[PDB]
């Protein structure tokens, strides 16, 4: 009944580490005392329900706050000038000066200027009044209420799902593909065609009249006759103004491509057609697997048969079905890797192809969103690899994977790790050397000696996609090619203009700075992969510790014997690779932010000139753009960016405090706590007040965790401020 | 220059410094005689 | 303009959700 | 396998796994690992000798 | 020519960069009197700057809008001298280095005291190995064919999987 | 499908897959597989060429029959792999 | 209304979390 | 408390016992080894986990091996 | 030998220190170490300081078995005193004789000792964690 009820070992633990480790292993349900697989799965299911309810509550809170305290209605009239308000500020610590400064956005109270793009998203989606946002918040609140009740219900005795149902892979994948992806995307396309395109074209479609108003003048007669080109006929004109009927068409499903000229975002007809088609594909693919009707596929059979001839990949994929369906960590790793790749994809695609009206001219929101999603992508990738390592050290069965495609990975892990080391070494050596060459050459007053490699291959991709300033004249750039001619009446007439228009972030012009920074990004990705892959492959054992699987995933060490065994557990591989995830995402975000600040400000010949050397990054990006942030508050007064300056210094302080736990280790602090225990016990008066848990220094893995925590939170706070405040102060 | 001093000069760090000295001098002289070669 | 009654109704639904959250936390704790 | 012989170690957990060593002594009865293989490649601890069983060794060259 | 870049010889920005560097040097020349070592050194330096710019103009390097040479590394033989020929030169030199190291290691492993030979290099034979590594591509190919380069993995230490 | 109710389709010890991998077409002969694969390749490539290469696709010209026949080209690949498998299995 | 920030922010961010910290401490110091 | 185990690769060289600063390990008679003795851990509850036994073990891999586990006042080695 | 202590032996002459037991050896468990010396002489306490072990019997109180064993190693390897005995004293005054449990130091084999924590196979033959997943045992 003591705090770690799930772990009787921590229950008998008498020191203060009991509380730390109980909180830390609260959610490590697999290793809890007296745990069975069925109970584990049911608990995971209920926790998923609660988590979904949290997500929808967060969404409803954002919606309600913008409805109640935000200037959504005023912003709708003038999207490009009025600054969106996130929520009102309630702070008794604010002075009169801060009150006047934070009173902004055309309201009489202090407020926070939204940098999440929710205003643009909802305006594009079809929200026009605070009432719609409030009703959305109410409905999401009801949804979360139902999800919480469902989570409670699915732990009851008569309503507790079984392990066979949990492990029913075919039905789950069929339903997720067909309905969760497919029918939900179909629902979104229907929403667009019924509510968003009419609202963009100046029609108020809501629940009271969406049943009466026809999305298309012809109705479903074209859909049933098969003359679906009537839904593309009469597209929106280039003189269309978003939210008004002037210049508005009647088409509901088009493939115009490019961007809407006024809003510089893709056409809602194009997006509706996208979601409709993509759903067709997914609803088809959700009929792949066999579920209670004979017709379909058997995933175990597929994996078993996929073994190439003559044992090229050993025994092929035999046993992989069993390992994946038995081990939740492998499923978690696959999910995290896929979702991290998808997060990187959305980060790369939203800025290049904006979808929300007037987002492109909102420079702060774009940078905030890109940085946000790139960081989360990095975290998801690190988690995918960490859970792969946990699977290897906890759930991997060599008897099942005898001569398997997965076992051969462990078989030639030495080759894999050595070659990842080679490529990381080459990339870092050469990228750093070229950067230093450029640094010294510009330093010595002779920039002509800079070694500047043109990214010819990326430029060739841009030319093949439609760029023409490079003059390569290949594929779509060459109007005559089969690629350019076959698609010349669907999307190219708009895409060509969009890509060759220099006012867009679609396929930005690139140069030697882009070459060098891309090779740096390659170095970051390769080294992070090296650390993570090595951790995963050596989690089971090593020449320095062949029996590591007995110790498990996260243990402090093996002692000073055999030369020392620091950070050998393959959890410390994750903890090391987290630094590199932060490093490479920071490089990515610095590249994005500087190139986009230059492009938005209209001087791309600052990035093209200065980015070739590192002092250009240190001066024309960091030092130059740090002035509006650090000048948030000074001796003469304060501005509305004082919060960003304070949070900038805050992230610096946390990043610095992490170095304490990372550098100084447990013995010093343990002995110091012995001294403090002596003092407290020996002083009078205070010694009547006595602890219950014996105070001890933080454990080794605990302190590694705390130091990495302080590092990461620090990273994100510092760049968030610098990316949100410098953009605001420069535009 | 006994066999012991020849052995000491043959030790690893002395040899590393000597060879890298000759290499750096070679590179620097190639720079003096063929300067500013950002090409072939 | 969101009204006082609207805010109070949303707050009531939020309180119902809170009660359900405590219940779900209990049932996950057992 | 035979004293003075070069033998490849086949113990998976050995530092010298799939590597050669010179046999110096084979004991009588008793020891579950009678053979005493002497190496020249010190492991992490520093020792260059270890006791192995006959099944954990495969001769590559005889005396 | 390619990538939108223009030859550096017909590059207005390149000519202005040359002129600006020349004007900077001549401006700093005012402090020193005629005939002094500093004056003559600056004269040599400005001559070197002009010679460097003329050499870049003559070599056929492509200058971008920034007015600096951009090296085209795509494999076209028009710009082979940028990367392909230096690449071959480095590959030959690095192969020479690695072959000298490997061959000396093969010699030392058979020595009675390989551990001491690792620190104390046998210089008379080290020079021989360094000289003989000039023909490494044929020597490495010969060792590959005879099978004395890649040890069978059934003979390399491997951690418990 | 469960772990138990699943056919023994592993064939790493043998030179060709068992015919059971073909599922519903575990008994259709290699002759039928090959002829259908060839007809499918020809028809599908004809449809693709008529849709996007011989003609230029557009909202007013996209043809459902050509679009559907395009999907016979991957079906043709599957059918030809199937023809080889059945020829090797002796059917 | 504009009443509710004053009523709710301090109740929810001084009183409730202090009570939660008290409850958690008392609970973890049981038995 | 930590779990101390001894495997039959023991050669009875009695160095883990001497490295032991808590009297957890002790030599007992054994038929397997030539020396006729094997290390054993009858007092694992007094184990602290400094792994001096593991450091002093000369086997190619450790005959004496310690797995850290449930912590206690003795295992933490707290004077209070 | 026996689970008993005189609890009146003259202790080493020591001027006091801050390294001793603190409000836990009297509530949870204390430790004692008793030895005999041929001469009255100076030694270093495990707690910081210098003490004078008396001629003949000497008794010392400590808070850790590690502290007692460290003092024992000091006594053996400096003063050649090898008759020390170590006791654990509970708040209920029970005394448990711990270190030279058989009357001889553990490094020398005895005929009566039985093996605790002995595994009949090599270290690299334990079952995988997946085998013991969702079972109360462990891979050793
Ligand atoms: C997670 C979503 C979320 C977030 C981040 C916020 C944030 C905020 N709200 Mg709240 N709020 C939300 C949802 C949310 N709200 C919802 C859905 C409603 C009902 C429609 C309200 C109604 C509301 C009012 C009426 C007021 C605020 C106010 C505030 C501010 C002060 C904090 C406070 O006491 O509010 C909390 C107040 C409540 C009555 C509790 C709401 C309960 C939510 C739904 C819980 C969601 C939990 C989350 C998903 C996960 C757990 C969190 C934590 C336990 C780890 C702050 C900016 C004040 C303001 O405007 O200050 C300037 C204010 O007066 N909010
Ligand atoms: C003495 C320093 C101090 C203090 C005590 C506060 C206090 C506050 N500020 Mg802040 N503020 C400060 C300095 C300070 N500020 C400075 C220097 C500036 C620059 C001018 C600002 C600018 C500022 C703004 C612009 C805003 C605030 C807000 C707030 C309020 C937070 C409301 C809430 O529900 O948060 C809830 C708190 C949290 C969720 C943080 C806890 C997260 C923990 C660490 C994670 C773990 C959770 C759990 C244990 C598991 C609160 C009154 C906000 C406000 O009024 O909202 C209504 C707001 O919008 N402040
Ligand atoms: C059509 C039927 C159907 C549907 C709709 C769902 C839906 C769901 N199931 Mg599933 N499930 C089904 C049948 C179905 N299930 C069946 C038959 C079984 C038994 C065989 C299961 C067994 C099962 C389990 C065991 C679990 C779920 C869970 C879930 C949830 C997954 C998490 C989530 O919400 O991700 C949302 C994902 C999407 C909306 C898909 C799109 C994702 C892309 C990448 C995002 C695109 C971004 C977009 C541009 C954003 C714009 C803003 C989700 C609510 C999990 C859960 O949370 O339980 C509470 C869970 O644990 N299901
Ligand atoms: C799942 C998404 C979805 C949903 C729920 C609806 C719902 C509706 N659509 Mg449809 N619609 C959708 C997607 C969707 N649409 C898409 C993707 C398109 C483009 C092809 C259309 C194009 C369309 C037209 C052109 C019309 C409708 C109409 C209707 C009604 C048809 C009733 C019916 O047969 O329902 C079956 C389930 C209803 C309001 C008709 C109407 O007048 O609605 C009021 C109508 O004229 N829809
Ligand atoms: C992907 C699906 C999807 C999504 C994300 C949305 C999103 C939205 N719709 Mg809806 N809508 C959809 C499908 C969808 N719709 C379909 C298929 C139709 C039929 C054509 C409509 C017709 C429609 C109308 C007529 C209106 C909306 C409106 C809205 C907004 C408020 C929703 C609300 O209050 O929900 C609250 C309810 C919930 C959170 C529960 C949802 C259902 C649960 C999760 C069961 C899932 C199965 C919001 C932007 C309103 C608006 O103002 O739009 C601009 C509005 O008036 N929608
Ligand atoms: C789908 C997502 C997902 C899921 C379901 C899980 C689930 C799990 N992970 Mg995790 N994991 C994820 C993503 C996920 N992970 C990601 C993205 C990463 C990469 C960072 C990791 C990295 C990771 C590692 C390295 C490990 C796990 C482990 C685990 C297991 C136990 C975790 C635990 O005890 O939590 C409970 C944890 C806590 C209560 C601590 C939370 C501390 C938070 C994050 C602090 C937030 C910062 C600060 C307070 C806020 C500042 C505000 C301002 C000032 C559990 C099965 C462990 C495992 O399986 O061990 C055998 C394990 O070792 N995971
Ligand atoms: C700027 C800081 C920095 C630098 C330069 C490096 C460098 C390296 N790290 Mg990383 N690393 C860092 C921070 C840094 N790390 C941090 C904070 C952590 C968290 C603890 C890690 C954790 C870490 C791990 C765990 C691993 C790496 C690896 C690597 C290698 C990556 C590939 C590479 O670039 O090789 C090329 C090397 C360079 C660019 C620098 C080399 C030195 C320059 C070129 C000077 C040349 C010598 C000079 C002439 C001597 C003059 C002396 C007088 C390399 C040794 C991985 C590795 O070893 O892969 C093989 C690896 O496993 N790092
Ligand atoms: C004897 C020379 C020698 C040779 C033939 C190789 C060969 C190899 N090393 Mg290298 N390596 C060497 C020395 C050598 N190494 C030394 C001294 C170190 C310690 C710094 C390393 C550290 C090292 C690492 C960390 C890695 C390699 C890797 C590799 C492989 C890729 C080649 C590469 O990228 O090299 C990289 C070269 C270096 C990092 C620096 C080399 C140092 C100098 C310049 C050369 C030594 C010459 C020596 C003094 C010659 C004496 C002979 C003379 C007396 C006659 C390859 C098997 C990588 C791998 O495993 O790929 C599969 C890899 O990850 N090596
Ligand atoms: C190139 C190397 C290669 C070699 C093989 C070999 C094999 N595969 Mg195949 N396979 C490959 C690649 C390969 N595969 C790849 C890349 C995938 C991933 C997509 C698959 C996925 C796959 C599955 C899922 C299955 C096989 C099976 C088999 C076996 C029977 C093949 C056969 O006769 O099919 C005969 C095929 C036909 C007669 C025609 C059907 C094939 C076409 C392409 C279907 C198209 C459907 C259509 C487009 C749907 C709409 C699309 C969208 C809108 C949803 C055989 C061992 C089958 C088996 O039972 O194995 C145990 C099996 O179930 N393979
Ligand atoms: C350790 C481990 C693990 C983990 C792992 C991971 C974490 C991974 C990741 C991974 C990743 C993260 C990957 C990625 C991938 C990707 C790819 C592979 C891509 C591809 C692409 C393509 C193919 C494309 C193409 C194209 C198109 C289509 C269009 C345009 C053009 C182009 C050409 C671009 C697991 C769990 C499994 C378990 C076991 C162990
Ligand atoms: S191998 Fe280790 S446990 Fe065995 S006798 Fe030697 S030191 Fe003691």
Backbone angles phi, psi at E7, to 5 degrees: -60, 140
SS3 I74: helix
Using a CB cutoff of 8 Å and minimum separation of 24, what contacts does A157-166 make?
Answer: A160/A42, A161/A41, A161/A42, A161/A45, A162/A38, A163/A37, A163/A38, A163/A41, A164/F2, A166/A41, A166/A45
Answer whether G5 sits within 8 Å of A90, measured CB to CB.
yes
Helix (H, G, I), strand (E, B) or coil at A15: strand
- What is the rounded distance in angstroms from the CA atom of residue A348 to the CA atom of residue A370? 7
Residue A37: both structure tokens together: 């697989």
**To 10 degrees, the CA torsion angle through A155, A156, A157, A159?**
-80
Q: Terminal CA-to-CA distance of chain C, rounded, Å?
A: 44
Instruction: Specify which residues H66 forms β-bridges with.
Output: H4
Contact D11 I122 (CB under 8 A): yes
Confirm if F31 and F79 have CB atoms less than 8 A apart: no
Across A222-252, b (16+ Cβ under 10 Å) vs e yields beeeeeeebbbeebbeeebbbbeeeebbbbb
* Residue of C7, C10, C27 lying closest to A152 (CB–CB): C27
What is the 8-class DSSP label of residue F53? I
Our mutation pick for probing the ligand 9 site, out of A170, A174, A277, A306, counting the most ligand atoms within 8 A of Cβ, is A306
Please report, to the nearest 10 degrees, the dihedral formed by the alpha carbons of residues E47, E52, E54, E55 taken in order: 140
Which ligand is closest in space to the CA of residue H16?
11
DSSP I15-56: ---SSS--SSTTTT-EEEEEEEESS-EEEE-SSSSEEEEPSE
Are A155 and A46 within 8 A, CB to CB?
yes
Contact A380, A343 (CB under 8 A): yes
Rounded Cα distance between A325 and A319, Å, is 10
D61 membership: H or E segment, kind and range: strand D57-61
With H, G, I as helix, E, B as strand and everything else as coil, classify residue A504: coil
Residue A530 Cβ < 6 Å to ligand 7: yes
Q: Quote the CA–CA distance of A684 and A149 in Å, as a whole number.
A: 54
Residues A428 and A524: their CA atoms lie apart, in Å, by 9
Q: Which residues of A touch G6 (CB under 8 A)?
A: 90
The set of residues, in sequence order, having a beta carbon less than 8 Å from that of A230 and lying 6+ positions away, is A216, A218, A222
Nearest Cα neighbor of A60 from A142, A150, A123 is: A142
> If 0-12 CB within 10 Å is exposed, 13-18 middle and 19+ buried, where does residue A55 land?
middle
Mapped onto helix, strand or coil, the DSSP state of residue A111 is: strand
Angle at Cα G13 formed by Cα G9 and Cα G19, nearest 5°?
135
Q: I3 to each of A565, I94, I99, I100, how far by Cα in Å?
A: 41, 8, 12, 12
**Contact call for C and E: 3+ CB–CB distances under 8 Å:** no
Residue I128 carries which DSSP code? P
Closest CA to A361 of A266, A244, A265, A269: A265
DSSP secondary structure letter of residue A84: P
Distance between CA F66 and CA A619 in Å, rounded? 59
The whole-angstrom separation of Cα I53 and Cα I38 is: 10
In eight-state DSSP terms, residue I124 is G
Q: Tell me which of A23, A52, A65, A112 to substitute to probe ligand 1's pocket, judged by most ligand atoms within 8 Å of the beta carbon.
A: A65
C-alpha distances out from residue A478 to A338, A472, A679, F49, Å: 36, 8, 82, 21
**Cα distance between residue A7 and residue A12, in whole Å:** 9
- For the beta carbon of residue I110, count every other beta carbon within 10 angstroms: 15
Mark yes or no for CB contact D45/A544 under 8 Å: no
Closest by CA to A726, choosing from A622, A585, A587, is A622
Method of determination is cryo-EM
- Residue B21 CB partners (closer than 8 Å, separation 6+): none
- Measured by CA distance, the residue closest to atom 1 of ligand 4 is A187
CB A549 within 8 A of CB I129: yes
Parallel/antiparallel/unpaired status of strands H3-7 and I118-119? parallel
d(CA A47, CA A43) in angstroms, rounded, equals: 6
Chain centroid to Cα I62, Å, comes to 10
Give the contacts of A151 (CB within 8 A, at least 6 positions apart): A45, A46, A47, A48, A49, A50, A53, C24, C27, C28
Provide DSSP, A396-429: --TTTTTT-HHHHHHHTHHHHHHHHHHHHHHHHH
Dist CA A701 CA A554 (whole Å): 7
Q: Which is it for the CA torsion A341, A351, A369, A651, positive or negative? A: positive
Strands A637-638, A633-634: pairing is antiparallel
How far does the centroid of ligand 8 lie from the alpha carbon of residue A505, in Å?
43
A400 touches chain F (CB under 8 A): no
What letters, b where the CB count within 10 A reaches 16 and e where it falls short, cover A321-343?
bebbbbbbbbebbeebbebbeeb
Q: Are A365 and A359 in contact (CB under 8 A)?
A: yes
Give the resolution to one decimal, in Å. Answer: 3.1
Give backbone dihedrals phi and psi of A279, rounded to 5 degrees, phi first: -70, -40
* CA angle (C19, C25, C26) in 5-degree steps: 90
φ, ψ for residue A638 (rounded to 5)?
-140, 155
What's the rounded Cα separation, in Å, for the pair I3 and I87? 8
Direct distance between the N- and C-terminal alpha carbons of chain I, in angstroms, rounded to an integer: 33
Q: Are D61 and D3 in contact (CB under 8 A)?
A: no
In residues, how long is chain A? 731
DSSP state letter for F50: I
* DSSP three-state, residue E62: strand
Q: Which residues of I touch H75 (CB under 8 A)?
A: none
The two structure tokens encoding residue A242: 């978003």
Residue H16 among known ligand-binding residues: yes
Give binding residues of A for phylloquinone as ranges: 669
Query: What is the dihedral sign for C-alpha E88, E89, E94, E100?
Result: positive
């Amino acid at each position: 009944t003591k705090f770690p009820k799930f772990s009787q070992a921590l229950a008998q633990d008498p020191a203060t580490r009991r509380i730390w480790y109980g909180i830390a292993t609260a959610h490590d349900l697999e290793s809890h005392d007296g745990m069975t697989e069925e109970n584990l799965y049911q608990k995971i299911f209920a926790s998923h329900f609660g988590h979904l309810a949290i997500i929808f509550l967060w969404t409803s809170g954002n919606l309600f706050h913008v409805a109640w305290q935000g200037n959504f209605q005023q912003w709708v009239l003038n999207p490009l000038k009025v600054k969106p308000i996130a929520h009102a500020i309630w702070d008794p610590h604010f002075g009169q000066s801060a009150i006047k400064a934070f009173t902004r956005g055309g309201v009489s109270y202090p407020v926070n200027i939204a940098t999440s793009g929710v205003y643009h998203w909802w305006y594009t989606v079809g929200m026009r009044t605070n009432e719609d946002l409030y009703f959305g918040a109410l409905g999401l609140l009801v949804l979360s209420t139902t999800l919480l009740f469902a989570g409670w219900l699915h732990l009851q005795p008569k309503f507790r799902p079984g392990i066979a149902w949990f492990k029913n892979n075919e039905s789950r994948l069929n339903h997720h593909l067909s309905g969760l992806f497919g029918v939900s995307s179909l629902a979104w396309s229907g929403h667009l065609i019924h509510v968003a395109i009419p609202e963009s074209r100046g029609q108020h479609i809501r629940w009271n009249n969406f049943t009466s108003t026809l999305p298309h003048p012809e109705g479903l007669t074209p859909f049933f006759t098969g003359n679906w080109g009537l839904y593309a006929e009469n597209p929106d004109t280039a003189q269309h103004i978003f939210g008004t009927s002037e210049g508005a068409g009647t088409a509901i499903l088009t493939f115009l491509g490019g961007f809407h000229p006024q809003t510089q975002s893709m056409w809602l007809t194009d997006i509706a057609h996208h979601h409709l088609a993509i759903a067709v594909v997914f609803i088809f693919a959700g009929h792949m697997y066999r579920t209670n009707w004979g017709i379909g596929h058997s995933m175990k059979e597929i994996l078993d048969a996929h073994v190439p001839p003559k044992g090229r990949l050993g025994a092929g994929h035999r046993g992989l079905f069993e390992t994946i369906t038995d081990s939740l960590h492998m499923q978690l790793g696959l999910a995290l890797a896929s979702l991290g790749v998808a997060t990187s994809l959305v980060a790369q695609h939203m800025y290049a192809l904006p979808s929300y009206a007037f987002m492109a001219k909102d420079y702060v929101t774009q940078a905030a969103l890109y940085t946000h999603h790139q960081y989360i992508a990095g975290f998801l990738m690190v988690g995918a690899f960490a859970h792969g390592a946990i699977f290897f050290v906890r759930d991997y069965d060599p008897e099942v994977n005898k001569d398997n495609v997965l076992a051969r990975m462990l078989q030639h892990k030495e080759a894999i790790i050595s070659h990842l080391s080679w490529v990381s070494l080459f990339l870092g050596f050469h990228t750093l050397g070229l950067y230093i060459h450029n640094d010294v050459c510009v330093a010595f007053g002779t920039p002509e000696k800079q070694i500047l490699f043109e990214p010819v291959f990326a430029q060739f991709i841009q030319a093949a996609s439609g760029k023409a300033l490079y003059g390569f004249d290949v594929l779509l750039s060459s109007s005559t090619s089969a690629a350019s001619v076959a698609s010349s009446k669907i999307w190219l007439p708009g895409w060509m203009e969009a890509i060759n228009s220099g006012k867009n972030s679609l396929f930005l012009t690139i140069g030697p700075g882009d070459f060098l920074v891309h090779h740096a990004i390659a170095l970051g990705l390769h080294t992070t992969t090296l650390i993570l892959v090595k951790g995963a492959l050596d989690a089971r054992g090593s020449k320095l510790m062949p029996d590591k699987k007995d110790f498990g995933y996260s243990f402090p060490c093996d002692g000073p014997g055999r030369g020392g065994t620091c950070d050998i557990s393959a959890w410390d591989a994750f903890y090391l690779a987290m630094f590199w995830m932060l490093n490479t995402i920071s490089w990515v975000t610095f590249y994005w932010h500087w190139k986009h600040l230059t492009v938005w400000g209209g001087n791309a010949a600052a990035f093209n000139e200065s980015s070739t050397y590192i002092m250009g990054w240190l001066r024309d990006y960091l030092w130059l753009n740090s002035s509006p942030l650090i000048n948030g508050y000074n001796a003469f007064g304060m501005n509305a960016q004082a919060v960003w300056a304070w949070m900038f210094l805050f992230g610096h302080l946390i990043w610095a405090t992490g170095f304490m736990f990372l550098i100084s280790w447990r013995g010093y602090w343990q002995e110091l706590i012995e001294t403090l225990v002596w003092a407290h016990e020996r002083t009078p008066i205070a010694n009547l007040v006595k602890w219950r848990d014996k105070p001890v220094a933080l454990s080794i893995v605990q302190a590694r965790l705390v130091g990495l925590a302080h590092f990461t939170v620090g990273f994100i706070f510092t760049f968030a401020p610098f990316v949100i405040a410098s953009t605001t102060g420069k535009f | 220059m006994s066999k012991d001093l020849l052995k000491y000069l043959s030790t690893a760090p002395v040899l590393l410094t000597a060879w890298m000295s000759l290499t750096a001098g070679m590179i620097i002289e190639i720079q003096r005689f063929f300067p500013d070669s950002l090409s072939f | 303009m969101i009204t006082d009654s609207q805010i109070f109704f949303a707050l009531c639904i939020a309180l119902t959700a809170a009660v359900l959250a405590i219940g779900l936390g209990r049932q996950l704790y057992v | 396998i035979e004293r003075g012989s070069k033998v490849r170690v086949l113990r998976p957990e050995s530092y010298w796994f799939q590597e050669c060593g010179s046999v110096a002594t084979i004991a009588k009865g008793g020891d579950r690992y009678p053979v005493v293989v002497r190496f020249e490649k010190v492991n992490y601890a520093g020792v260059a000798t270890n006791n192995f069983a006959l099944d954990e060794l495969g001769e590559v060259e005889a005396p | 020519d390619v990538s939108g870049l223009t030859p550096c010889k017909d590059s207005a920005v390149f000519k202005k960069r040359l002129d600006g560097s020349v004007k900077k040097l001549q401006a700093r020349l005012a402090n020193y009197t005629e005939g002094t070592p500093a004056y003559l050194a600056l004269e040599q330096q400005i001559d070197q700057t002009k010679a460097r710019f003329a050499k870049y103009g003559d070599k056929g390097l492509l200058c971008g809008a920034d007015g600096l040479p951009h090296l085209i590394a795509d494999g076209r033989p028009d710009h082979a001298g940028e990367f392909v020929i230096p690449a071959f030169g480095f590959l030959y030199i690095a192969g020479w280095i690695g072959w000298a190291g490997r061959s000396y290691l093969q010699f030392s492993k058979k020595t009675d005291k390989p551990n001491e030979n690792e620190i104390i290099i046998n210089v008379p034979v080290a020079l021989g190995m360094m000289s003989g590594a000039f023909l490494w591509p044929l020597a490495a190919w010969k060792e590959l064919i005879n099978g004395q380069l890649l040890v069978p993995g059934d003979e390399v230490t491997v951690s418990p999987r | 499908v469960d772990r138990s109710e699943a056919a023994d389709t592993w064939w790493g010890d043998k030179d060709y897959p068992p015919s059971i991998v073909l599922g519903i077409g575990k008994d259709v002969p290699s002759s039928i597989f090959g002829v259908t694969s060839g007809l499918a390749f020809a028809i599908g490539v004809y449809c693709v060429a008529q849709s996007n290469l011989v003609n230029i696709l557009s909202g007013s010209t996209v043809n459902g029959f050509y679009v559907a026949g395009a999907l016979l080209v991957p079906y043709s690949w599957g059918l030809h792999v199937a023809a080889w498998i059945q020829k090797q299995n002796g059917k | 209304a504009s009443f509710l920030p004053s009523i709710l922010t301090p109740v929810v961010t001084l009183v409730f979390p202090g009570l939660m910290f008290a409850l958690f401490f008392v609970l973890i110091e049981q038995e | 408390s930590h779990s101390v185990r001894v495997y039959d690769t023991c050669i009875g060289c009695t160095q883990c016992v001497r490295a032991c600063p808590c009297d957890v390990l002790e030599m007992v008679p054994w038929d397997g080894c030539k020396a006729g003795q094997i290390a054993s851990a009858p007092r694992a509850e007094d184990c602290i986990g400094c792994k001096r036994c593991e450091t002093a073990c000369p086997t190619d891999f450790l005959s004496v091996r310690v797995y850290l586990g449930s912590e206690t006042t003795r295992s933490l080695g707290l004077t209070y | 030998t026996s689970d008993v202590l005189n609890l009146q032996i003259p202790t080493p002459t020591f001027g006091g220190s801050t390294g001793g037991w603190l409000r836990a050896a009297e509530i949870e468990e204390k430790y004692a170490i008793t030895w005999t010396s041929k001469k009255e002489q100076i030694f270093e306490m495990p707690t910081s300081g210098a003490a004078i072990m008396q001629k003949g019997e000497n008794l010392l109180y400590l808070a850790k078995k590690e502290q007692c064993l460290a003092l024992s190693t000091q006594l053996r390897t400096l003063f050649k005193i090898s008759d020390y005995k170590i006791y654990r004293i509970f708040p209920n005054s029970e005394v448990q004789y711990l270190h030279p449990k058989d009357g001889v130091f553990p490094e020398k084999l005895n005929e009566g000792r039985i093996g605790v924590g002995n595994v009949g196979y090599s270290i690299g033959k334990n079952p995988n964690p997946v085998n013991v997943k969702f079972t109360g045992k462990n891979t050793f």
